[PDB]
Amino acid sequence: PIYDLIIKNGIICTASDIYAAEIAVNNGKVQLIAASIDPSLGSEVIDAEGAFITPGGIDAHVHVDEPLKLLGDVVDTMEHATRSAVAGGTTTVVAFSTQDVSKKGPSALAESVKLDVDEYSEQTLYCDYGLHLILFQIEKPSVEARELLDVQLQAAYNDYGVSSVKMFMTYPGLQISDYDIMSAMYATRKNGFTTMLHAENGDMVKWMIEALEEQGLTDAYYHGVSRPSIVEGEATNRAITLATTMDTPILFVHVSSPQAAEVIKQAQTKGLKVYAETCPQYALLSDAITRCHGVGIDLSSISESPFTNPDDRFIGSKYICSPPIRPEGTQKSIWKGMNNGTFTIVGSDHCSYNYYEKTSTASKHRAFDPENNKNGEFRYIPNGLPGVCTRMPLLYDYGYLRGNLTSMMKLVEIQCTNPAKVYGMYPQKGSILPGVSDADLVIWYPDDSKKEYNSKPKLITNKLMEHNCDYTPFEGIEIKNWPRYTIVKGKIVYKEGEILKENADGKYLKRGKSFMCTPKNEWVTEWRPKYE
C-alpha cells in the first residue's frame, strides 16, 4: 500500500477547527487530509468510530532524573516519563538541564545539556523530548560578563537546539537576585530565547517558614501557610517590571495565584509579551487535601489521602508542591485564566517521589533523616506531583466534558499547539499539517456511545500511569475518557491500555527560536542595549 496508516470516521480537532475528515500517514508524517480515503491504500486502518482526534499533547514542564541531582533523586527516568506520557496521550515532553557550575568558558552551558542527552541516549524512549536550561549562577558585574553569557547561550543553541532558559525567584541554592535576572534577560532577548520564571518571593517564604517552625507548626499543611498567594503575586509583579525595563518576552511557569494572574492579565492587555503556564492541580485540588477532615474534583473520592487515612500524619506530603495547592475558592480563577487568554499553555510540573517505600533517596520520607536534623518538617518534604500521564485526560474530562473549558479547540490550543509555538517546535510538532507535521496523534473513545469498551478505564489507578512511581495523587477518581490510540511519528505506541514497546523510537529534539519571543521593541526610557 501507498501509506503506512489511515485514520477513518474520526473528528479532527485543532487549535481553531473541529470537523469530520480522514487522515493518511506515511514515513512518520501526516501526508493528507480528505473527506474519505480508500482503505486499500493503507497498510493499517483505524476506525475512530466518531471519536475526536487531537494532536499529541506537548508537556513542556516535566522533571526527570538527571545526573546533577538538582531536585535530589527522582523516580522517573526519561524512559519512564515518556512511557507515562504516551499512555496519557502526550507525545512530546520538555525536561530540564541543570547548569553545571564545574564547566567553564564558552561551552559551559552546551556541556550541561550534553550530560542529559548522553544519559538518555541509552534508554528506550517512547516519544521525543527536548530540554530547557536552568540557570542559578550568574557572573557579576553585568557589563563585563555580557560577552561570555551571550556566547554561552549561542553555543547551547548551535550545538543542542536549546532556546529556553529557566530561572527561580525562590528556593535556597536556586533563587537569584533582580540584578542577575536583568543580566540574563539582556542575553536572552539578544538571542531570541524563551525566558521562564518561577515567581515566588523567596525572602518572604524563608522568613515565614522560620516563624512557623518557631511555633512548632511543621505539618505538611503549613507548607501552604508559609507562602500565601500574595507572595506569588508580588514576585510576578516584580518580574513583569524587570521584563518591561529590559523589553524581554517572559513566561511564568505554574501560575496558581489570583494576584499573579491579575498583574499578568494587565500586562497582556497593555500588549507586553508576557506568557503564562498553569497546571491541572491548581484548577482541580484545594489545600483541604493536605490534612485530615464544585468546580474541582470531589476530594472525598480520592483514595489514600488524609481523609481515608487520618492515622497517617505524613500522607499530606503526596500533594506538596511549589507553588502550593491553594485554599478553597481559588480554583475557579484558574479555569477562567485558561479560557480568557491569561494562560498560554498548560503543563504538569511532573515531579515524582515514592510514598509507599520509605528507605530510598527518591522517597517522600526522605524528610525523615534524624542524623541530618530532619524529622518530617514540611521544609524537608520533596516538592512535586506525578502528572505527565493525567494532564490530557483530566482536561478532556473536567475541562471540556464538564464545561470548565469553553471548547475542544481551547483544549488543543493550550495543551498542544501553543506549547510547540512558544518553545520553537512548531510546525514539526503541535498540529495536524499534511507534509509538515510529525504524525503525533491521539484517538479518543467516542463520548456519546452506548457500546461497551472493555479497555476504557473508569477510574485513575497507579497501574494505569505506566510510570515508575508507586502513587498518583488522583488515585480513585472517575475519569470519563482516555486515549484509545496514541500514535507517535506514524506508529501506534499505545493501543487500548497496552504499550507497544517495539514501536518506541523517540529522539532528542533540537528546537528553533520561537516566533512568539521576538521583542516588542518598546522601552521605558531613551536607553537601548549596545547591540541596537
Ligand X SMILES: NC(=O)NCCC(=O)O
Using CB under 6 A, which residues numbered 315 to 374 contact ligand X? 321-322, 349, 351
Using CB under 5 A, which residues numbered 177 to 206 contact Zn ion? 198
Pick from 384, 424, 483, 490 the residue near ligand X by CB under 6 A: 384
512: cell is: 528553533
Q: How many residues bind ligand X (CB under 6 A)?
A: 8
251 backbone dihedrals φ, ψ, rounded to 5°: -115, 125
| Mode of pairing for the β-strands spanning 42-47 and 128-134 | unpaired
Pick from 208, 299, 401, 499 the residue near its own copies by CB under 8 A: 208
Pick from 23, 24, 46, 63 the residue near ligand X by CB under 6 A: 63
Other C-beta atoms lying within 10 Å of the C-beta of residue 158: 10
Q: How many residues bind Zn ion (CB under 5 A)?
A: 2
> Which residues, in sequence order, are CB contacts of 227 under 8 Å at separation 6+?
200, 204, 205, 208, 323, 324
Other C-beta atoms lying within 10 Å of the C-beta of residue 294: 5
| Closest to Zn ion by CB, 30 or 414 | 414
Taking the complex as a whole, the smallest distance from the CB of residue 281 to ligand X amounts, in Å, to 9
Q: Count how many Cα atoms sit within 13 Å of the Cα of residue 14 in the half-sphere of its side chain.
A: 12
Taking the complex as a whole, the smallest distance from the CB of residue 167 to its own copies amounts, in Å, to 14
Which range, of 176-184, 316-324, 346-354, 358-366, touches its own copies by CB under 8 A? 176-184
Taking the complex as a whole, the smallest distance from the CB of residue 433 to Zn ion amounts, in Å, to 30
* Radius of gyration over every alpha carbon of the chain, rounded to an integer in angstroms: 23
268's contact among Zn ion, its own copies, ligand X, none, with CB below 5 to 8 A by partner kind, is its own copies
Say how far apart CA 61 and CA 59 lie, in whole Å: 6
Say how far apart CA 320 and CA 64 lie, in whole Å: 18
19 membership: H or E segment, kind and range: strand 18-20
| Closest to ligand X by CB, 136 or 307 | 136
116 membership: H or E segment, kind and range: helix 108-120
63 assigned to a ligand binding site: yes
| Closest to ligand X by CB, 71 or 442 | 71
277 lines the binding site for Zn ion (CB under 5 A) = no
| Closest to ligand X by CB, 71 or 149 | 71
139 lines the binding site for its own copies (CB under 8 A) = no
Pick from 7, 13, 21, 346 the residue near its own copies by CB under 8 A: 21
Amino acid residing at 74 = V
198 assigned to a ligand binding site: yes
Question: Where in 40-127 does DSSP place strands (E)?
Answer: 42-47, 52-55, 57-59, 90-98
211 lines the binding site for its own copies (CB under 8 A) = yes
Amino acid residing at 513 = K
139 backbone dihedrals φ, ψ, rounded to 5°: -70, 150
391 membership: H or E segment, kind and range: helix 391-394
Asked if 218 and 378 count as a contact pair (C-beta separation under 8 A), the reply is yes
Using CB under 5 A, which residues numbered 339 to 358 contact Zn ion? 349
358 assigned to a ligand binding site: no
166 assigned to a ligand binding site: yes
Residue 434 buriedness (CB in 10 A; 0-12 / 13-18 / 19+) = middle
Asked if 352 and 65 count as a contact pair (C-beta separation under 8 A), the reply is no
Which residues of this protein are in contact with its own copies, per CB under 8 A? 16-21, 33-36, 141-143, 177-179, 182-183, 201, 203-204, 206-208, 210-212, 214-215, 217, 225, 228, 230-231, 233-234, 237-238, 241-242, 244-245, 268-271, 336, 339-342, 407, 413, 417, 427, 431, 433-436, 515, 524-527, 530
Which residues of this protein are in contact with ligand X, per CB under 6 A? 63, 71, 321-322, 349, 351, 383-384
Which residues of this protein are in contact with Zn ion, per CB under 5 A? 198, 349
